[PDB]
Coordinates of C-alpha atoms in Angstrom, one line a residue:
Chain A
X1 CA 59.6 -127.7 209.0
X2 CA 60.3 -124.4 210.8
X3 CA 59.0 -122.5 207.8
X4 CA 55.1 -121.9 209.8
X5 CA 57.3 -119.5 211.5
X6 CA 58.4 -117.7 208.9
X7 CA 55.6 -117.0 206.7
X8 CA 53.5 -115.5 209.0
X9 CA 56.4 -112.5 208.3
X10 CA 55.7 -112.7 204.6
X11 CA 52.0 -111.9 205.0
X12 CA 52.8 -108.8 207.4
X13 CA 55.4 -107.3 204.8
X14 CA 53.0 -107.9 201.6
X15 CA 50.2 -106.0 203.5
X16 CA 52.4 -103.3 204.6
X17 CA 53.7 -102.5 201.3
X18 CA 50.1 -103.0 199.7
X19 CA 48.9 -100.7 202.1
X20 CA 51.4 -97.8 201.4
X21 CA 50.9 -98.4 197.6
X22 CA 46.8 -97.4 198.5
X23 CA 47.8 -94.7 200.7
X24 CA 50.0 -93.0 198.1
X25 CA 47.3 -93.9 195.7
X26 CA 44.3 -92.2 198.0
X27 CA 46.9 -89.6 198.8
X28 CA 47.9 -88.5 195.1
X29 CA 44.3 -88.8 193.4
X30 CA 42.9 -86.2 196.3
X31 CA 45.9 -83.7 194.8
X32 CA 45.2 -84.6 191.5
X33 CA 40.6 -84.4 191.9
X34 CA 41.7 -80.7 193.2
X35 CA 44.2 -79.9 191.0
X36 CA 41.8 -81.3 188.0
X37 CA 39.3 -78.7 189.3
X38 CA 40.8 -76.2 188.6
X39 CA 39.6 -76.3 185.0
X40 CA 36.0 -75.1 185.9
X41 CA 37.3 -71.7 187.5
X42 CA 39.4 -71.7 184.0
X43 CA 37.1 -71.6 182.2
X44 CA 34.7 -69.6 184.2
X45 CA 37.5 -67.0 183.7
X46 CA 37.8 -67.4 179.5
X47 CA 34.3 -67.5 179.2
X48 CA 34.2 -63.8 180.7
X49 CA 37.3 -62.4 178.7
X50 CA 35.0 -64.1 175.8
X51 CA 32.1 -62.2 176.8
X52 CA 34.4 -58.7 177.2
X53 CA 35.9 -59.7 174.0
X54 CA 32.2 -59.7 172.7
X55 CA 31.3 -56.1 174.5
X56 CA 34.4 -54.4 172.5
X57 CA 32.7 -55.8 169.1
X58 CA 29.2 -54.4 170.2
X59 CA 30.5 -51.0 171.3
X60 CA 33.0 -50.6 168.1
X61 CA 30.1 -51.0 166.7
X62 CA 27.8 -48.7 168.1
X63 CA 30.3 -46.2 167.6
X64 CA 31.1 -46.5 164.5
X65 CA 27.3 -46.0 163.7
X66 CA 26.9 -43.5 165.6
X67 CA 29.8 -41.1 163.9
X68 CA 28.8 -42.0 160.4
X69 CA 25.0 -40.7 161.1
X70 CA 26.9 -37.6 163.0
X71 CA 28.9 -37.5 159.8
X72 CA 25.6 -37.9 157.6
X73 CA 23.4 -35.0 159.5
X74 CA 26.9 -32.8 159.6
X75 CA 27.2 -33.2 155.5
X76 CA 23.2 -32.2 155.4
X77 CA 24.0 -29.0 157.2
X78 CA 26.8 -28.0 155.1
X79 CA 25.1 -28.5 152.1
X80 CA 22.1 -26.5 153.5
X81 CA 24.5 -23.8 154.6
X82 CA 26.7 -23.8 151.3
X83 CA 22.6 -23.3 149.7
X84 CA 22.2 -20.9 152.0
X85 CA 25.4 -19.0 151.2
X86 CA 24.7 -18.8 147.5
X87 CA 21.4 -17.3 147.8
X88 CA 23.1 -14.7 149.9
X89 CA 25.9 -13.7 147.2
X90 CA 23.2 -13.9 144.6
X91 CA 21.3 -11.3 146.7
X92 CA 24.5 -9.4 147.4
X93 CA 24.5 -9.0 143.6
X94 CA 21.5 -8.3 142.9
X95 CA 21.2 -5.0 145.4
X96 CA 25.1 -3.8 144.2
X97 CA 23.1 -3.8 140.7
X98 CA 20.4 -2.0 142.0
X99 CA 22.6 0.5 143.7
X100 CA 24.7 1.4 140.6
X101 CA 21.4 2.1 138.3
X102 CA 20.0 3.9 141.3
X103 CA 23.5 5.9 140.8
X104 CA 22.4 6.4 136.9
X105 CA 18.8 7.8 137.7
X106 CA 20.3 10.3 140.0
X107 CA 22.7 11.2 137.5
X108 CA 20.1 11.4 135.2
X109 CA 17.8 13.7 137.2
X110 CA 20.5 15.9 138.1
X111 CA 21.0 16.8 134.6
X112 CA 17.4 17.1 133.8
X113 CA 17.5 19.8 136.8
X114 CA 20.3 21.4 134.7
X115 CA 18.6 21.1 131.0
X116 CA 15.7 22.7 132.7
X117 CA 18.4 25.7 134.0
X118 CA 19.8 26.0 131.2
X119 CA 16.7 25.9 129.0
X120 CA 15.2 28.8 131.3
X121 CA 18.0 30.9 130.4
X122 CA 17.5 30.2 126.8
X123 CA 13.9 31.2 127.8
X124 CA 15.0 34.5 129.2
X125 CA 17.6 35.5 126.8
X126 CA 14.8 34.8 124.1
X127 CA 12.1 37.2 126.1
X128 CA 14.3 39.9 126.6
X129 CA 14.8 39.6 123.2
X130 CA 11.4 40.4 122.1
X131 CA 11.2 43.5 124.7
X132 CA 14.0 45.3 123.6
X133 CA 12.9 44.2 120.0
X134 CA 9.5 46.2 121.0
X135 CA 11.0 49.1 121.9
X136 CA 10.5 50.2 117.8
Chain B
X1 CA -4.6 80.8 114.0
X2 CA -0.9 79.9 113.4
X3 CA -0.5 80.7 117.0
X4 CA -3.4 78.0 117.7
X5 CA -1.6 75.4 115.9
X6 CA 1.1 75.8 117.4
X7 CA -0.6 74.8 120.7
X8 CA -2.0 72.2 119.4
X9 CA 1.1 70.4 118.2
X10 CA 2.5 70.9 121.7
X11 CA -0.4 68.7 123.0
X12 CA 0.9 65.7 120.5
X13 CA 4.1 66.6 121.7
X14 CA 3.1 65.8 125.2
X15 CA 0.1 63.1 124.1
X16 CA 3.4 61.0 122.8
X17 CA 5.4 61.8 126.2
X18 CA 2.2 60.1 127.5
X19 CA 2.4 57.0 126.1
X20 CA 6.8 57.4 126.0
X21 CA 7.5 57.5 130.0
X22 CA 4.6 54.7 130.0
X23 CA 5.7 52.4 127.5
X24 CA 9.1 53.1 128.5
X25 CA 8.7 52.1 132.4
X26 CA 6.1 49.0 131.3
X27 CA 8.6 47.8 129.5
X28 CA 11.0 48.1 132.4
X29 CA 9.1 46.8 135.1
X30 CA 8.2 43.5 132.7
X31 CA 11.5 42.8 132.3
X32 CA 12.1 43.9 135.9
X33 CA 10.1 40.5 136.5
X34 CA 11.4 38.0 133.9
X35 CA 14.9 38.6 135.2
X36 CA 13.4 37.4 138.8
X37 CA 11.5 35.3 137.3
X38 CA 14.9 33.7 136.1
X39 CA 16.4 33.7 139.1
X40 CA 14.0 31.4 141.3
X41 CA 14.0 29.0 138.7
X42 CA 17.7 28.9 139.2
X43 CA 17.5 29.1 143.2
X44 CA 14.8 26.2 142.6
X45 CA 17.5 24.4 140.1
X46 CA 19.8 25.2 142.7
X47 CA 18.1 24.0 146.2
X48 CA 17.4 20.7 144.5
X49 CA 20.5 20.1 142.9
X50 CA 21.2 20.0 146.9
X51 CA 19.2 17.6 147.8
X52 CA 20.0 15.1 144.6
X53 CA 23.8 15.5 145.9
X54 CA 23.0 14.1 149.2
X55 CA 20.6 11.5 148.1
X56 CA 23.6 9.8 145.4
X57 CA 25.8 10.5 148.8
X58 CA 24.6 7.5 150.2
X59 CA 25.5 5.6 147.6
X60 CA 29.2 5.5 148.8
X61 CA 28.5 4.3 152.1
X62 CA 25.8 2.1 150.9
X63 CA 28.6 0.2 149.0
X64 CA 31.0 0.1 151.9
X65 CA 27.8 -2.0 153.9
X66 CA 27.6 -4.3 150.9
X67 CA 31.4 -4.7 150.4
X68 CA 31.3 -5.7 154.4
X69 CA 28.4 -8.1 153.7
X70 CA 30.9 -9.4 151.3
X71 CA 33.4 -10.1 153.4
X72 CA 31.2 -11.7 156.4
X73 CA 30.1 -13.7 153.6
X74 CA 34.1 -14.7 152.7
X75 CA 34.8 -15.1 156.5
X76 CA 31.7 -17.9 156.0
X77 CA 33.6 -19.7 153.5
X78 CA 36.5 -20.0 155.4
X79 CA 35.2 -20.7 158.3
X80 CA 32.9 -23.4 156.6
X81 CA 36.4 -24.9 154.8
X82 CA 38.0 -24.9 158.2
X83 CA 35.4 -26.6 159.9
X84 CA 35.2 -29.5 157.3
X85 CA 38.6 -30.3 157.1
X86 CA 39.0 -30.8 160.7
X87 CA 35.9 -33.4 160.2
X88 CA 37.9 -34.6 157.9
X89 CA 40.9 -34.9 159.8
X90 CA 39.2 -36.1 162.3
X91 CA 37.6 -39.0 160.7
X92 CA 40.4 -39.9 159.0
X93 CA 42.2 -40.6 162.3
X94 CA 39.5 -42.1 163.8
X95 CA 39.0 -44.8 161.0
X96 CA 42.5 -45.7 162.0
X97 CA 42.1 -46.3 165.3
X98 CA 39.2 -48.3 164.6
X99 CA 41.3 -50.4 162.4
X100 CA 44.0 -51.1 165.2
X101 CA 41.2 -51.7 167.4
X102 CA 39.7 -54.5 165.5
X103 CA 43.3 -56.0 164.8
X104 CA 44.1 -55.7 168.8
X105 CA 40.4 -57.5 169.5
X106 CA 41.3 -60.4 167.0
X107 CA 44.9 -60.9 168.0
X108 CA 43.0 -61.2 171.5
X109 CA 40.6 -63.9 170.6
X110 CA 43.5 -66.1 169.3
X111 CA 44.8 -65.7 172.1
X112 CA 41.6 -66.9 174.1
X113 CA 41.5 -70.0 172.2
X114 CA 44.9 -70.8 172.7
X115 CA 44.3 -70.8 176.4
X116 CA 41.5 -72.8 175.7
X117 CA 43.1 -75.7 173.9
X118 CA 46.1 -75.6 176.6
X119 CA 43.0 -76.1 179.2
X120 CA 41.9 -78.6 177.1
X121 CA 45.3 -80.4 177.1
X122 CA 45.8 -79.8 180.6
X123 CA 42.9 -81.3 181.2
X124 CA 44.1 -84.6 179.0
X125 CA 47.1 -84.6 181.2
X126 CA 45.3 -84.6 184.4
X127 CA 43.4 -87.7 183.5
X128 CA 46.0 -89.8 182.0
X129 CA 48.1 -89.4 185.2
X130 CA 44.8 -90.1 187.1
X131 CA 44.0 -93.4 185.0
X132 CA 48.2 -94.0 185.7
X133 CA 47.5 -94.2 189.9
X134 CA 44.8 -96.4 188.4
X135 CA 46.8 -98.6 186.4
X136 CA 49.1 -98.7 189.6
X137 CA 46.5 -99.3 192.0
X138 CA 45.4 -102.2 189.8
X139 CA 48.0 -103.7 189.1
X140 CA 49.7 -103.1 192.7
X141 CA 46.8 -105.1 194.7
X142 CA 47.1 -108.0 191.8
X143 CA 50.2 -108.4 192.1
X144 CA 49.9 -108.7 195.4
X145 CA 47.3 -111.8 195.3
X146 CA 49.7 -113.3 193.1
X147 CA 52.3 -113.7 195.7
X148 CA 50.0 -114.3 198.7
X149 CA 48.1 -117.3 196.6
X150 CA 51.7 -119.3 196.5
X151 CA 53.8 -118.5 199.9
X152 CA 50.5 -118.8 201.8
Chain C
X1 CA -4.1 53.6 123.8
X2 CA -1.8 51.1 121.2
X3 CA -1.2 48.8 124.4
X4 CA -3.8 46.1 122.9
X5 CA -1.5 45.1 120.7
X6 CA 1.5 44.3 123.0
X7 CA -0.6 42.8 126.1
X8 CA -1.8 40.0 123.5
X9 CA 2.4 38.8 123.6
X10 CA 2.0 39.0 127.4
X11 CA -0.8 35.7 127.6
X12 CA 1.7 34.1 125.1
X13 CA 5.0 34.2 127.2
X14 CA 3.0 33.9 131.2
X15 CA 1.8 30.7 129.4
X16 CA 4.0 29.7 127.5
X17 CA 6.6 29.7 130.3
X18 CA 3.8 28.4 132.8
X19 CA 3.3 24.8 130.5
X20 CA 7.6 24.4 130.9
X21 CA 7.3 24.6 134.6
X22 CA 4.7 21.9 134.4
X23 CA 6.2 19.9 131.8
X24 CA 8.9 20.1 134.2
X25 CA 6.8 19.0 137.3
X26 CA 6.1 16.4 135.3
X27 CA 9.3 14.8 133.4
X28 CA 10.9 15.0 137.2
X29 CA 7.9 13.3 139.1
X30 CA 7.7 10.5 136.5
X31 CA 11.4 10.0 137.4
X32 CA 11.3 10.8 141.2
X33 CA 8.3 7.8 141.0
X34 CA 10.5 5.6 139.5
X35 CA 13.7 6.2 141.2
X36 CA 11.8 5.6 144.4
X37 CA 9.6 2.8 143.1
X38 CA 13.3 1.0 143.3
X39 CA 12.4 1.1 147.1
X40 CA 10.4 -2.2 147.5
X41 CA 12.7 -4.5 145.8
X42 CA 15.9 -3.1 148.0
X43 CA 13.4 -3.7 150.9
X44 CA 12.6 -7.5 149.6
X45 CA 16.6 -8.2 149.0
X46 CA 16.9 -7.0 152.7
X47 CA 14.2 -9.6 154.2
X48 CA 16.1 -11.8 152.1
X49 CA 19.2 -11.7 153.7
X50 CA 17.2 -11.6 156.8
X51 CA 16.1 -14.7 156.6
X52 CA 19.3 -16.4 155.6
X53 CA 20.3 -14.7 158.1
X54 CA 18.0 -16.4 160.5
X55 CA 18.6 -20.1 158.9
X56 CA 22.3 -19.8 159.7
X57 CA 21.3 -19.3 162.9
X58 CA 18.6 -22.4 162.8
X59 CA 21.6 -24.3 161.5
X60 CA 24.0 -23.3 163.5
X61 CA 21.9 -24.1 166.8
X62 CA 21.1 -27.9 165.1
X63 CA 25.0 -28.6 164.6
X64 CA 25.4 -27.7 168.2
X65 CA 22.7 -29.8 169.7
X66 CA 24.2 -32.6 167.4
X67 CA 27.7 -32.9 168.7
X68 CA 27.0 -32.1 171.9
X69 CA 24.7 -35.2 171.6
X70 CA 27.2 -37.2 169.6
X71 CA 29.6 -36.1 172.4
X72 CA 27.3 -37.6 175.1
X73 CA 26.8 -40.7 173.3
X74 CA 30.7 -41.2 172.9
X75 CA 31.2 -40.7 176.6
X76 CA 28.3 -43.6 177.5
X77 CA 30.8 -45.8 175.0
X78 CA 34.2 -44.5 176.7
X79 CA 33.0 -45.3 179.9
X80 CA 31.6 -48.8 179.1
X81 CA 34.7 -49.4 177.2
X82 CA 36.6 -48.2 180.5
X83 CA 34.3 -50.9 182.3
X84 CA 35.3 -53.5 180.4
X85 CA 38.7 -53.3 180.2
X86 CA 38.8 -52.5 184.0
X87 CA 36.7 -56.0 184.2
X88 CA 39.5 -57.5 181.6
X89 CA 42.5 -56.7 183.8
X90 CA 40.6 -58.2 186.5
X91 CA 40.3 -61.8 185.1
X92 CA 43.4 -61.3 183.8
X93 CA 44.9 -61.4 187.2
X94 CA 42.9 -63.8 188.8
X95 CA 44.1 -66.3 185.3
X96 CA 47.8 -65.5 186.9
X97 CA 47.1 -66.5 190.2
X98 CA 45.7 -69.6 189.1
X99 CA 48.3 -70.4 186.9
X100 CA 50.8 -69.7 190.2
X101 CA 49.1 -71.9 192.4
X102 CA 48.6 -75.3 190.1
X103 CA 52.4 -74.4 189.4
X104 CA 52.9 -74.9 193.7
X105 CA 50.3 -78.1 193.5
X106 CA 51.9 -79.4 190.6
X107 CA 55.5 -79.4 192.9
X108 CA 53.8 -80.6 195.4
X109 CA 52.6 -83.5 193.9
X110 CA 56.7 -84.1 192.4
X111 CA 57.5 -83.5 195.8
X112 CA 54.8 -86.4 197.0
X113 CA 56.3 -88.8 194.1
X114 CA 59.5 -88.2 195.2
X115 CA 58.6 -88.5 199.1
X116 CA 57.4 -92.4 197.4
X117 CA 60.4 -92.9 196.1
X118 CA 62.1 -92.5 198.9
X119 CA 60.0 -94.1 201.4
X120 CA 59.9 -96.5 198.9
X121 CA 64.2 -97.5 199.3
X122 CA 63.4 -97.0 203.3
X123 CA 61.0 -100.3 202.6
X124 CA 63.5 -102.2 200.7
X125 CA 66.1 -102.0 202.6
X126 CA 64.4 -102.4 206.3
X127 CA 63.2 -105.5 204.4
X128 CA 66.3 -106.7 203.5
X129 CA 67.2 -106.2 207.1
X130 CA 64.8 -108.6 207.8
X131 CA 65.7 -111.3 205.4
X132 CA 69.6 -110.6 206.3
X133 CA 68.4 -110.9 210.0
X134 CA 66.4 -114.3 209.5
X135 CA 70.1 -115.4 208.2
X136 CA 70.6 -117.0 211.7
Chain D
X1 CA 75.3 -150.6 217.0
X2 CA 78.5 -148.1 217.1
X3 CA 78.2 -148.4 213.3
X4 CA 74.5 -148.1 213.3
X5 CA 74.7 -144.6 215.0
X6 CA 76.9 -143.2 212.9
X7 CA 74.9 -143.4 209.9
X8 CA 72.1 -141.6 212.0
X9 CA 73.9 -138.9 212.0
X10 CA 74.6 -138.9 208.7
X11 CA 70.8 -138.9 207.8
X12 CA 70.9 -135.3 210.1
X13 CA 73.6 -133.8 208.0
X14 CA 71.7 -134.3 205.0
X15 CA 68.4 -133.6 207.3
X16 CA 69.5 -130.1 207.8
X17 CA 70.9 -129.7 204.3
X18 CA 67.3 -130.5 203.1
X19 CA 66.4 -127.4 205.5
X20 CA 69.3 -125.2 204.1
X21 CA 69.8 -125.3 200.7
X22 CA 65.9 -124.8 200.7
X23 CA 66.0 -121.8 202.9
X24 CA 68.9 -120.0 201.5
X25 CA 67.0 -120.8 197.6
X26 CA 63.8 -119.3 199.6
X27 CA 65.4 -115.9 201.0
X28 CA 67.2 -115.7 197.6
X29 CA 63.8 -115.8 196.1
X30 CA 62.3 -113.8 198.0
X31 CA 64.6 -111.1 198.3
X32 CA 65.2 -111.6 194.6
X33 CA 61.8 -110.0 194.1
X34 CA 62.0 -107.4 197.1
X35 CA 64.0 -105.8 194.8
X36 CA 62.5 -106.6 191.4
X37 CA 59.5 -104.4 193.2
X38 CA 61.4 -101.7 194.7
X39 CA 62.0 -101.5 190.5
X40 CA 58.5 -101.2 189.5
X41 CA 58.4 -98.1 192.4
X42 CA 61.0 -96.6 191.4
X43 CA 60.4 -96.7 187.3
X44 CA 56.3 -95.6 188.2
X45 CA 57.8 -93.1 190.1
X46 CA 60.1 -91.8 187.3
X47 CA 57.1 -92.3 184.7
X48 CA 54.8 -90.5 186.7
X49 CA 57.5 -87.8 186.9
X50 CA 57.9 -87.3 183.4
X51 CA 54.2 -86.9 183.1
X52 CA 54.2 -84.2 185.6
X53 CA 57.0 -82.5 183.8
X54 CA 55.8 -82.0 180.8
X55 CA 52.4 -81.2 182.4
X56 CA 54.1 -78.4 184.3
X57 CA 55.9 -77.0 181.2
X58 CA 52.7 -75.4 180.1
X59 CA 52.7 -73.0 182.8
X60 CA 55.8 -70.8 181.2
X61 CA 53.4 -71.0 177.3
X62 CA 50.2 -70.0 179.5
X63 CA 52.3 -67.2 181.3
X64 CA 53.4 -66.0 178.0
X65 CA 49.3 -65.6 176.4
X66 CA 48.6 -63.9 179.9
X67 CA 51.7 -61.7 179.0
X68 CA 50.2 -61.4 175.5
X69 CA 46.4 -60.3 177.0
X70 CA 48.1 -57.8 179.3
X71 CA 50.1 -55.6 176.2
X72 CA 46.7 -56.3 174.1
X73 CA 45.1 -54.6 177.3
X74 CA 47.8 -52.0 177.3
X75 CA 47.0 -51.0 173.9
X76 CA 43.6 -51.0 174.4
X77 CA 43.9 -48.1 176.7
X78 CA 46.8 -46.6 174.0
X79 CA 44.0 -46.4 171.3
X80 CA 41.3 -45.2 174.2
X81 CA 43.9 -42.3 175.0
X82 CA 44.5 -41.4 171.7
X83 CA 40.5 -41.1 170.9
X84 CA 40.2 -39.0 173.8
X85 CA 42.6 -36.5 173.0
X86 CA 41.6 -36.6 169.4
X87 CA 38.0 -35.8 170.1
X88 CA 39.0 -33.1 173.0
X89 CA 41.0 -31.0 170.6
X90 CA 38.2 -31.4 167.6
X91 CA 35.6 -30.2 170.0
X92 CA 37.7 -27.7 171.4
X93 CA 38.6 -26.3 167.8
X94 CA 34.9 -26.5 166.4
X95 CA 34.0 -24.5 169.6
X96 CA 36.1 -21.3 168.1
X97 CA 34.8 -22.1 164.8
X98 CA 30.9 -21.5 166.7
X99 CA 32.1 -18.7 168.1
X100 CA 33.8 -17.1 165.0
X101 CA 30.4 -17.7 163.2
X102 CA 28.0 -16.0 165.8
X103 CA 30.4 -13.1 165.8
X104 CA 30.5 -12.9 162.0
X105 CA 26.4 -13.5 161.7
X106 CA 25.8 -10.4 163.9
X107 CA 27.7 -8.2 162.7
X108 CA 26.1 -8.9 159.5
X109 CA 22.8 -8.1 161.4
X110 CA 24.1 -5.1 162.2
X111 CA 25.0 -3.9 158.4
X112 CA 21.8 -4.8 157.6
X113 CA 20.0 -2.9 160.2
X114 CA 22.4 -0.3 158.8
X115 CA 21.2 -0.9 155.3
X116 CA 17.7 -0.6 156.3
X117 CA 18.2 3.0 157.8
X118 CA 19.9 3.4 154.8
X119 CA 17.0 2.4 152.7
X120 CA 14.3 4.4 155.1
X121 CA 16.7 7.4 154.8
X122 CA 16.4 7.7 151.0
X123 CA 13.0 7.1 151.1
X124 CA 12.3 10.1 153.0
X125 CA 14.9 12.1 150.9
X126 CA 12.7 10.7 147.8
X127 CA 9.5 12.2 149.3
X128 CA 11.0 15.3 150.4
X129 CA 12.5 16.1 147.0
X130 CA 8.7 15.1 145.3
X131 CA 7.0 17.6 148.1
X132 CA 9.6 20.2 146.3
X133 CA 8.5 19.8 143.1
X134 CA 5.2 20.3 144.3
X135 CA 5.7 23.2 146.3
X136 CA 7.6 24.2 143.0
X137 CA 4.7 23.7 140.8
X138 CA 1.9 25.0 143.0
X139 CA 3.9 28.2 143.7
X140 CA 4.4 28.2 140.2
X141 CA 0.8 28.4 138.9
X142 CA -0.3 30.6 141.9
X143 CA 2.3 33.2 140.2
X144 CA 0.8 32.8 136.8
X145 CA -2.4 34.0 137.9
X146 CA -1.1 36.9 140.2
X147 CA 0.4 38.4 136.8
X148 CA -2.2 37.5 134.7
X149 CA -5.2 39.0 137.0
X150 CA -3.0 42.8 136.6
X151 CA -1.8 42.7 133.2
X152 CA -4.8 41.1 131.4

């Protein structure tokens, strides 16, 4: 029975592969705890292109409220100017007509001046006439 | 007395004379008058006349300052038709860029949670080799005990 | 002395001529009034046109303060969009380096399963060289 | 006893036969399962390996939505480009428009300043002509009665 001798081997060989099997065990889970975190950082980093991704939908949408009330108070003014354009050819009008009938009463007293020149040498004509009609 | 008669007719010949050469220059000197009198009334006719011709002068230039007030108000216009179709315009290509924009921003966010779920998975991964060292480890130090319970 | 007689036609031409010269002065004055009674309403067109004149000008100076504040509002947005996407880029490249160095843990880890492996055949057969040796 | 000691030694040679057909059955088990584990290392090793494989695969799909974010990005800053030019040239053109207006409203201020002369101008034409007609008319009756206080 010389076997005493030869399984105190077996007990030294059993441990020393048991013990690489937990040293490649305590080896690979420290890779794999560090590797596995990672996914915080990850996400850190998603959650902020989430939150940019947000900013963009905020300021699209500021902008586009503030052109359509630039667009609003820019259509007020050209309506008040187009008013205020009107009112000025309606004027425009209204003194061209008062020009030509001031043209008219000009006219008109310029031949009164003449009817009255005219009518004063009907006036002499017809006074003469009664002076050399008196010399009877 | 015929020779006093005679006299006495040359008196009415002269008494006539009297009232001839008086008559005859009244009548001469009134209508020495009426023929100047004619002629202011015709200076008169005349100096204003003047004046009504300068007065409808200004009609000519006051039409030129309307017709130029026309055309400022024309040059309004245009300038008013100008100005709104570059708003126009400008709006028109704005709205288009806002379109891309939003398709650009959403094509992103897909993108995001794709990353996401490949995080996700990765994560899976990580833990299923994990609980595989496990399963080794386990399974390693009992079959182990199964050996060292016969041969010792 | 038949004078009388012809002085009595004198009263009836000095005044007959004198009432034309006023009916004159008059017909013309009523027209001159008139004619220049046209005065106030050609001075009323004029303050008209004044005072469009003067709301171009008020609407001319409200359009300007307008885009030049819809201009300054659009800058604060360019700018904060500018931000952003600066932040955006950012992440973006601090997503690649992450993504590069799980991609060197990841091979190190092959690497580590491989070094197993191989250390693993180093056990077997210095084992064997053992159970080969205890042959004698 | 010659005979006796022979089959002694016979007992021996089946003694150590007892010893070594149970030690070679003993290193035949036992390196009959040496190898049987060097097995189980190597096929853990080649599952773990597959695991990490397909693990590190998603790296090229998670390049490829970073790749995706950057041209997103990229266009981002396209459209930003383009809304900057756009809005540069609109403000630049409604600038001359401004300017095209201020110059056309003055010199409308100008005809109607000009207008207003105009319009004081006739006035005193207007009055100077009605002073006429009453210089006319007062030097008219003051003649009357210088012909009037002789003849009658």
């Amino acid at each position: 029975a010389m076997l005493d001798s030869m399984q105190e081997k077996f007990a030294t060989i059993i441990d020393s592969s048991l013990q690489s099997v937990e040293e490649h065990a305590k080896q690979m889970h420290k890779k794999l705890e560090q590797l596995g975190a990672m996914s915080l950082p990850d996400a850190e980093e998603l959650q902020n292109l989430q939150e940019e991704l947000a900013n963009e939908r905020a300021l699209a949408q500021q902008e586009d409220a503030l052109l359509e009330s630039m667009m609003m108070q820019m259509e007020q003014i050209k309506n008040l100017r187009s008013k205020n354009s009107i009112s000025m050819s309606v004027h425009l009008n209204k003194m061209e007509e008062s020009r030509l009938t001031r043209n008219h009463r000009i006219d008109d007293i310029k031949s009164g001046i003449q009817d009255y020149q005219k009518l004063g040498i009907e006036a002499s004509q017809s006074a003469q006439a009664e002076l050399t009609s008196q010399m009877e």
